[PDB]
């Protein structure tokens, strides 16, 4: 009964920033962490960074001075903003449900195309 | 970060054969180790977690193994609802994933 669901914004052009909404249901933000992970097209997966129940984020180490993570609690939603895109940024980007060692449930995930 | 190197990057199948894939870490993950199967447009999904156990729901021709940098994935008898990419992945410090295995019908 979990449900995590995507929302981003389609096409964007590079150097822009993007912001993606993850949706969550069934559970709670403060008892889970939510980990963002991206697939380029063709590719494998990337892990990007994971925002705790308490609050506390992680960061691919790569890219994390390009990426911030946040919640509303109150709303149920994560967050994933990205500046300065590079067309390198385009992939599918889904947001995963943490428990133990593992991503037991995962979005749908959402396409971004950064195209000028 | 420790990396995880996927073995074979494709492979192709028949219905009813029995494969291994391999995932090596190029630094001791301690069997924080979690294998995924994804299939064409959709989302990853659980499969196997801390080395050895498997997610609900998943039928038991899959098995792992695995210690130090060394983890193994094995299904008996392919099923033609078991072709797609497989990927692990480590919870040793910062989490990464392996490259992924196509498992591609012959």
């Known amino acids: 009964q979990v449900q995590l669901q995507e929302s981003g914004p389609g096409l964007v052009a590079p150097s822009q920033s993007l912001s993606i909404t993850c949706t969550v249901s069934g559970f709670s933000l403060t008892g889970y962490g939510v980990n963002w992970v991206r697939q380029p097209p063709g590719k494998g997966l990337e892990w990007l960074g994971m925002?705790?129940?308490?609050?506390?984020?992680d960061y691919n180490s790569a890219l994390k001075s390009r990426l911030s993570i946040s919640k509303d609690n109150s709303k149920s939603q994560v967050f994933l903003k990205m500046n300065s895109l590079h067309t390198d940024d385009t992939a599918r980007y889904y947001c995963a449900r943490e428990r133990d060692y593992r991503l037991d449930y995962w979005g749908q995930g959402t396409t971004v195309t950064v195209s000028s | 970060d420790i990396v995880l190197t996927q073995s074979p990057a494709s492979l192709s199948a028949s219905v009813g054969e029995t494969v291994t894939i391999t995932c090596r870490a190029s630094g001791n993950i301690h069997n924080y180790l979690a294998w995924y199967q994804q299939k064409q447009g959709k989302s990853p999904q659980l499969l196997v977690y801390?080395?050895?156990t498997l997610a609900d729901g998943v039928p038991s021709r899959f098995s792992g193994s695995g210690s130090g940098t060394q983890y193994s994935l094995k299904i008996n008898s392919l099923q033609p609802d078991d072709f797609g990419s497989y990927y692990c992945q480590h919870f040793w410090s910062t989490p990464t994933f392996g490259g992924g295995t196509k498992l591609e019908i012959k």
């Open positions: 801390y080395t050895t």
């Open positions: 925002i705790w129940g308490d609050g506390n984020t």
